[PDB]
Amino acid sequence: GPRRLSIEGNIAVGKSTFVKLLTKTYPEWHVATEPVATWQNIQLGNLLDMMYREPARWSYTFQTFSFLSRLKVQLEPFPEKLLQARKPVQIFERSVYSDRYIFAKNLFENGSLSDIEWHIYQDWHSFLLWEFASRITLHGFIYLQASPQVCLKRLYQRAREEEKGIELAYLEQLHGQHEAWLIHKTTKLHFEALMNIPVLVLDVNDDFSEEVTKQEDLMREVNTFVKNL
Amino acid sequence: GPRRLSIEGNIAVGKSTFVKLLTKTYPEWHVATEPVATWQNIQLGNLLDMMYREPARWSYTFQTFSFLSRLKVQLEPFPEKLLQARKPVQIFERSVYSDRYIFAKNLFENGSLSDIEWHIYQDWHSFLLWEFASRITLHGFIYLQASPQVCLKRLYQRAREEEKGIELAYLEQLHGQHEAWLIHKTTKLHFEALMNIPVLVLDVNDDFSEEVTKQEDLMREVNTFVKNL
Ligand SMILES: Nc1ncnc2c1ncn2[C@H]1C[C@H](O)[C@@H](COP(=O)(O)OP(=O)(O)OP(=O)(O)O)O1
Numbered sequence: 001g002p003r004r005l006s007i008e009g010n011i012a013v014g015k016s017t018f019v020k021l022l023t024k025t026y027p028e029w030h031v032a033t034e035p036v037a038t039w040q041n042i043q044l045g046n047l048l049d050m051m052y053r054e055p056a057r058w059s060y061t062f063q064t065f066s067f068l069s070r071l072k073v074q075l076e077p078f079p080e081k082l083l084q085a086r087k088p089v090q091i092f093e094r095s096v097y098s099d100r101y102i103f104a105k106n107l108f109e110n111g112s113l114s115d116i117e118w119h120i121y122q123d124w125h126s127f128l129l130w131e132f133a134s135r136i137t138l139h140g141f142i143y144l145q146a147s148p149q150v151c152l153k154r155l156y157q158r159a160r161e162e163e164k165g166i167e168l169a170y171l172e173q174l175h176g177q178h179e180a181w182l183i184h185k186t187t188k189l190h191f192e193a194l195m196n197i198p199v200l201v202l203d204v205n206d207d208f209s210e211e212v213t214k215q216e217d218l219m220r221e222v223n224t225f226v227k228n229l
Numbered sequence: 230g231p232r233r234l235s236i237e238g239n240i241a242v243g244k245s246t247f248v249k250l251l252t253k254t255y256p257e258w259h260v261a262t263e264p265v266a267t268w269q270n271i272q273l274g275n276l277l278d279m280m281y282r283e284p285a286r287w288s289y290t291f292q293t294f295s296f297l298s299r300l301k302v303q304l305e306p307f308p309e310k311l312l313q314a315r316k317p318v319q320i321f322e323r324s325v326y327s328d329r330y331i332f333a334k335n336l337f338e339n340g341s342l343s344d345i346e347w348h349i350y351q352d353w354h355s356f357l358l359w360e361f362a363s364r365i366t367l368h369g370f371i372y373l374q375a376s377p378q379v380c381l382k383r384l385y386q387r388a389r390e391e392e393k394g395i396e397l398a399y400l401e402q403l404h405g406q407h408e409a410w411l412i413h414k415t416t417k418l419h420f421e422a423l424m425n426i427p428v429l430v431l432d433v434n435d436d437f438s439e440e441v442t443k444q445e446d447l448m449r450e451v452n453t454f455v456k457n458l
């Protein structure tokens with residue numbers, strides 16, 4: 001059975017970059033894409049923008065769309081490629097779990113989600129993950145960790161309309177969520193599986209985007225981590 | 230396998246009354262309750278009221294809560310009672326299907342649901358019903374049919390805070406939806422199963438609430454209908 005892993009991290013920490021690097025280094029590996037272009041244009045309307053401009057009005061709706069999307073991809077069948085490899089690896093950009101423990105949770109804590117919205121959201125989440133338990137399993141998390149300000153810098157370094165308005169405070173919040181869940185284990189979890197899952201912590205405070213030294217150094221840690229799963 | 234059926238009809242047409250009558254006449258029969266008391270008090274906040282007072286703001290949220298609820302009950306296992314009967318019957322108050330084809334649909338058509346909300350809702354609905362296809366099956370619909378004004382009268386005859394504000398027009402809309410789906414078959418369906426399902430049409434324009442003649446006359450049609458399933 002393929003090893004399933006999801007990349008977790010803060011906004012702009014450099015996920016897409018880290019993925020391009022993965023794709024290049026381990027081609028057999030299958031990377032399930034993250035729906036960002038499907039959120040800016042719903043097919044008509046930018047949900048992403050809406051969630052950012054009126055968080056108290058569109059946060060819940062957004063979460064329901066992202067959760068469904070993340071759940072769909074995690075339920076899809078393994079490709080034929082992945083099928084025929086000695087050590088198949090499937091990589092997800094963020095997960096069905098971060099949808100809840102990183103964003104939804106945070107959106108509630110900062111007031112963007114009402115008590116009713118948080119309650120309904122959790123009800124849904126716990127219900128479906130229980131029904132689909134046997135199919136959404138993950139073997140480990142690759143946490144691209146970096147400070148809020150570093151992210152804030154990168155966040156602004158790339159235009160991205162929707163985002164230009166994000167304050168440092170917001171990134172600090174999300175940072176907290178990641179640290180509480182993937183590092184300190186202080187976030188109450190509601191899934192026995194999620195309890196003890198391996199977490200590879202990659203420190204990307206220093207722009208690995210260009211230093212070929214650190215890139216080879218990252219892929220190395222990744223390979224070591226994946227193989228011992 | 231138990232025969233599964235759902236009671237469909239307009240607001241106040243007299244569903245709860247018709248159910249009390251069923252319970253009394255066919256005790257082996259199992260009637261899965263409809264969550265109305267769980268909507269007026271979420272456990273804190275009245276979603277039902279909210280949806281009515283600010284439809285453009287809470288319709289989508291409401292639909293997601295009612296859909297989940299209706300789906301949950303249709304996935305639950307048959308009770309032990311129902312288990313040991315020669316002809317087991319399971320009755321549902323409205324269904325996972327009316328959630329979409331009666332209310333959600335109508336809420337979109339009358340502007341309470343935006344294009345984005347309608348799209349996300351449908352995406353969810355079609356997805357989960359496809360995943361759970363084999364478990365949500367229904368064998369027939371009992372349509373408690375009556376004119377909008379008759380309903381409007383009954384609607385007002387019973388207090389019900391949340392509702393006091395419903396205009397005749399709204400009931401007319403819902404009436405249309407029922408007629409289009411259960412009678413004229415002019416509502417585009419998205420489930421092969423739902424295509425040709427039996428529909429028992431009970432005319433309840435005349436208050437059967439008290440006339441013991443019509444009650445015995447209704448249960449008779451019901452029994453005849455159920456047995457030939
Ligand atoms: N569950 C969520 N709830 C609310 N917003 C979310 C959620 N998940 C992602 N986002 C936001 C953060 C961003 O502004 C936009 C991010 O999409 P994405 O491109 O996947 O983020 P990112 O910041 O990790 O960049 P990238 O993956 O391109 O490197 O959507």
Ligand SMILES: Nc1ncnc2c1ncn2[C@H]1C[C@H](O)[C@@H](COP(=O)(O)OP(=O)(O)OP(=O)(O)O)O1
Binds near residue numbers: 328333
């Ligand atoms: N899917 C839905 N979307 C929006 N509102 C709904 C939906 N389903 C039911 N409702 C509303 C209509 C009512 O005002 C309240 C009705 O609940 P319910 O008691 O089941 O209705 P009813 O009008 O058929 O009466 P009863 O079953 O008590 O006879 O919730």
